[PDB]
Amino acid sequence: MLEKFCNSTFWNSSFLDSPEADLPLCFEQTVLVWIPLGYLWLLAPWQLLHVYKSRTKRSSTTKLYLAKQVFVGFLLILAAIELALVLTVPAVRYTNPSLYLGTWLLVLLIQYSRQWCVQKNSWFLSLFWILSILCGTFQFQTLIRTLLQGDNSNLAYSCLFFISYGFQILILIFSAFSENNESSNNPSSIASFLSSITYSWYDSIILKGYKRPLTLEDVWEVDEEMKTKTLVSKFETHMKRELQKARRALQRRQEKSSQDVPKSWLMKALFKTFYMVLLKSFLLKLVNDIFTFVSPQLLKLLISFASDRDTYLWIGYLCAILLFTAALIQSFCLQCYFQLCFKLGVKVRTAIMASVYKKALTLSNLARKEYTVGETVNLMSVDAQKLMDVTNFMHMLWSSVLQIVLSIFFLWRELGPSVLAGVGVMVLVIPINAILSTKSKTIQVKNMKNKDKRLKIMNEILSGIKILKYFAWEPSFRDQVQNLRKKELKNLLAFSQLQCVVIFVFQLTPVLVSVVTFSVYVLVDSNNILDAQKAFTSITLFNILRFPLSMLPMMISSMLQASVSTERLEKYLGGDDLDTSAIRHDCNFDKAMQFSEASFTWEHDSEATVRDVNLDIMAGQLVAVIGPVGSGKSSLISAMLGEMENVHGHITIKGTTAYVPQQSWIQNGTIKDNILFGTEFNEKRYQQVLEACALLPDLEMLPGGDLAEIGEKGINLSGGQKQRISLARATYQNLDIYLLDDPLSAVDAHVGKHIFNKVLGPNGLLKGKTRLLVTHSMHFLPQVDEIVVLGNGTIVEKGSYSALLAKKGEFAKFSIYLEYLQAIGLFSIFFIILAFVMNSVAFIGSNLWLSAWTSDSKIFNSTDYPASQRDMRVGVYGALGLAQGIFVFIAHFWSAFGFVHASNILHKQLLNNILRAPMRFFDTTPTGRIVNRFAGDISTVDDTLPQSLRSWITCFLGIISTLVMICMATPVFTIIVIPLGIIYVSVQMFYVSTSRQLRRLDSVTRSPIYSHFSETVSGLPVIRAFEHQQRFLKHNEVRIDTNQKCVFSWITSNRWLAIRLELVGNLTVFFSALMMVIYRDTLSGDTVGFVLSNALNITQTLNWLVRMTSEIETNIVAVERITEYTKVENEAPWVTDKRPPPDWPSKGKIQFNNYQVRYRPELDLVLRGITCDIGSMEKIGVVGRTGAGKSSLTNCLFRILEAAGGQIIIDGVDIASIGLHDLREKLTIIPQDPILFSGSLRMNLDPFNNYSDEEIWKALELAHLKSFVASLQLGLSHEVTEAGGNLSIGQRQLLCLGRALLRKSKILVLDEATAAVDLETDNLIQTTIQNEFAHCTVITIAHRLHTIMDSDKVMVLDNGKIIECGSPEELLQIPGPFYFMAK
To answer: What are 787's strand-pairing partners?
Structure first.
């Protein structure tokens, strides 16, 4: 290019050889300057028309806009001035000021233009500053040196340029800041560029979640573009276009076949709609992958630079700077790709998840019947979520190929054909990783059966805990479950070990691959000598090639799963839409309801369920339809709703329609929500229906009658109750036509009468509403306007009740972690940690040997390399290719035994503690939490936690190995770590304190989407009747969107951490490399290799140490919950040293002494000084009012409730001094509720197998249950289902009687044994009790008095006191409470 234009030298390569080297000034003022100025005038208009083409409301002139404006003005003054000195000479000397004059004017114009838009400091302007400082600094330093060197000939130019440069820095710093607009809820459209690429605008949420826990309202609205209303609209148009084009394709195929479902269209549709956001990434992965290969190729310069003491310093420093800048651009250009490629994740899930719903309301029933509710919901729960994950890394279907192919090429140059073996090992490890993953999968699945078996046994145990306590059977199940758990563990060990090898064969690959490649290359040709450049630019490349070649087998799974999951979706959205041509809604024709010789069928190609139906009804006619089953009673109403397919003839109606189903559909929420059904609250109407529906009293006993969580998961109502609610909903809405479906199905006759004459009848709410009622009840026909009896296909009678039908009636805290570690055993944790440390020491040891190996090339090369030296250096590196192998395999493996054993203690603690807890524990807390807490956590502490803990320690020592390795060369770096360490720790302390929350908010707000869809598809037919469809769509969007604002704010939070680590992972590779350049003298060329080649991987590892630390910090909450219960208090010891005589009790005499007891210390005394003496063989009945303390007395006899006062003595021995078991085995009780345990019938009778079958069979004979068991196919081995669901209530009670007769205790307590047993069985129970237990003390509690007249004495309990006690005859004579009850 021209040089006379500057009258100097453009290129003088001699200027780049001396240590003091600077670029030629002419080139420095003519090419560098043309970049930014060329940058503007080339992209000025687009960023100008794009501003005026779309016009926004001009905003206020904030303080910054003035400062950002005036500063550019000052540049114009300086730019104008420097033209004055020049004019008051080289051509370049005067044109350059002119160029700035024009440009400064323009940049002023734009900077005012941006004010209108929302994103004030966009990328275009903000980059021009950064690109006009890098291309400006070179000029800055040249002037500094020349001024310093003492020229002072161009000082006039220098001063003006200095200020011009200084202001340029100032403007940029202001550019990054963004004005806080009025609301702009999401700070994603107002954040300035430099704040929207380092995600510094998310700083608000993170420090907000550190003190005050987050909530749905504290997360910014999603956006104005990702709103599901927009996405559904956009995707719908493309979806419709492709489908119709796809439909045409099928027609040609079937036409050709003449001479199936339209497939392979969905994936095409998504492309045609998102090709902006798909393309802004493909042009952004390259810019990230290309910069992934500048970190290694620059490291070669420093190694090469340090290896020669006659290399100019500015080569090293410029390399150190680029090694930082070339890693910042990758960092920014990568995160800016994840956010831009995860956005495509949710933005595609919503486009489908929210678009499946809109098709659910339209799918023709003929196709809907193919599905079920359970699978349809999954169609957007797991089937439509695989589209997220595939879209989350769809771009790694070629980036991996590029990274692998390109990386192999770079490696090939440095090493040569030897590298083929190095890449070979990675190829070889792929299948090894694959095979074990499956073999682990089968074992995991094979274990699920055992897990289900344990829960089924346990879920029943907790409910049947009461009887468990009476007979002290606990140890039998303790062993019964312990054996089951032990069987599970033997399977578990295999699973953990198989996972150990997977970690081992992956954590060891980088160590082994180097050994193979650094052996073949130095073993093939004696000439080859490993040089520092050749090694540490290869060891680093493998760590870059490892990820793509170690994930490609995994990704292929996702991209193959999505090809079947997506296949289902097309088969769904492509379903034929329901046709409404058979029904026409209009008010023009006078009649209300009209039929035209129509016919309907439940199945398209089979018999017609409705034949030549011609019904014509006018407004206000209460018409009823009756007939037998199969004539089509329910079909007509179904036909009207349009949920049926006609054969011919049209049926048209007038006005709106209301419908009531025979099978009730109840929307989740409250009674008000269900009845109101999306309309305002009219108290007059609302109360009218409540009374007219008889629900006003039905809301009394309900805990939340006015507002209760009716529906699934909250409440269960009677069959009529839900029917009552449904008809209330139709009545309140006050529509034109009303269609009923047998409201008299499951309601009281009087109640049915009430509603009929209060709602349906002429006096009812709907006096003149066209009403159609279908049912089989003949009661209410006389009050009906017309009764069209439905014959077998058509009608028979067209008239009123008395018109024709009446003739004849003939068809009418860290402390937790220690607790977990305490379980795993401090002995093995010591060696587990130690083995890892010896592994790291070998790793740092391995690198040091490599350094002392490459050093040989300085000496040997021109001189031949002795075989002895070659065979040695290779050998040692091999002996350290195993020292790292052994100290890992013997490290992770010894851990697997540790973790499994820990899972064997925690589980053992619960059973040996929960079963010892008092009944108070189980009553207060719900049975659900115990099952869940002992289903997930106990499953979490063995299935996932150990897999996570091991990966944490192996990465922490990974970081320490690097930092110790860096410091070993340059001791000064120990200073730099303290700032970086604080920065990193202070980051983890924030991110993990929030990313844990925002994941909870995601799950808590995801379930409603599915629950809502399930409760819509189930209740679809009702919705179409009321035509409330549009209400639901707008009600599903506002619920699906409430999720995006949670997932999205999680992705960004997961992104704001990546930048502040990759910046820490660069401040540690930059400050490390810089110290190498400063300390040229003391560090040989090779030593810079391992120090700086390993530091390049610290950036990635610093993520895993934080990513995992989130899982551990959250997963371990599981073991904390388990820890809570094992520390719960427990009842008294089962066995005490003061054992009674083996024959005790001998007589059965029971004595009470001012006994007092209470359910809880906080509650009032329930027994208030009971004092009585029960003689041997005394049959006592206990009577009283409910809650008087009858039941509490029984619980005390077995010491279930500890004595608050007094005492109880049996056969002269105070039971409070005996162990509970020793007491309980000698007492027999027949519980009110005969609960049974799943398993063999023999087990239920005897859990310890302490009795022979002959004894069992006799006991059954006395229980009168022998015959039934003998009839059972397996006899004693018959399997009783859960809670004995397969046995009648009487049978279970008789079975319980069998238990009692077998035990043969001197004392027997009866607790309402015949309350729910038929008289015939009660006599059987009474007879055997009288005969079999004629020698044992009996205490009988029963609401049936007649069962107590036979007692020797009767005890009257009222309000916790004994009012009367005497024989039944004496008490009857005295006119007391017992006399009143008997009367």
So the answer is: 624
